[PDB]
CSV table of C-alpha atoms in Angstrom, one decimal:
chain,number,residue,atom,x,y,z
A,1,UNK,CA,104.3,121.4,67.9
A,2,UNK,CA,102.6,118.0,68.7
A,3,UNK,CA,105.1,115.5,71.2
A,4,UNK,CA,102.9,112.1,72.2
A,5,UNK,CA,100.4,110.2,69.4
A,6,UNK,CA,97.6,112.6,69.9
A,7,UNK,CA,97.6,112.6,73.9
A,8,UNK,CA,98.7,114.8,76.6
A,9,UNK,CA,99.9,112.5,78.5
A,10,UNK,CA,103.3,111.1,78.1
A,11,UNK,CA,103.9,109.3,81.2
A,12,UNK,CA,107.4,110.4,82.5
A,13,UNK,CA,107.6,107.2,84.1
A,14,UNK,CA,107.5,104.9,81.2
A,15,UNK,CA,108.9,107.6,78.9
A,16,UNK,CA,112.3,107.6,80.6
A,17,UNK,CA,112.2,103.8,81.3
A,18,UNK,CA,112.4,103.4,77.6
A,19,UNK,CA,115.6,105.0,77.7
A,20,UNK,CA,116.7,103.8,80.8
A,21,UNK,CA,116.8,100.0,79.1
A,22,UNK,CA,118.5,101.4,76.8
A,23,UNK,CA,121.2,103.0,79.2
A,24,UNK,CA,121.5,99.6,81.4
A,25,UNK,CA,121.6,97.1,78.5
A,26,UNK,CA,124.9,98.6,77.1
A,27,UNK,CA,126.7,99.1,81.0
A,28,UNK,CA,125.2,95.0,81.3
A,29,UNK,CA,126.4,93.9,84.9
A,30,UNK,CA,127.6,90.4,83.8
């Protein structure tokens, strides 16, 4: 049903940011 914390907002900016850290931080570019 519901997706966001009582919002329809869910920026798809920032919500696949949180991922992308995610993605990036384990292929780290020493």
């Amino acid at each position: 049903g519901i997706r966001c914390p009582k919002s329809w907002k869910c920026k798809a900016f920032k919500q696949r940011v949180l991922k992308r850290l995610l993605a990036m931080l384990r292929q780290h570019a020493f």
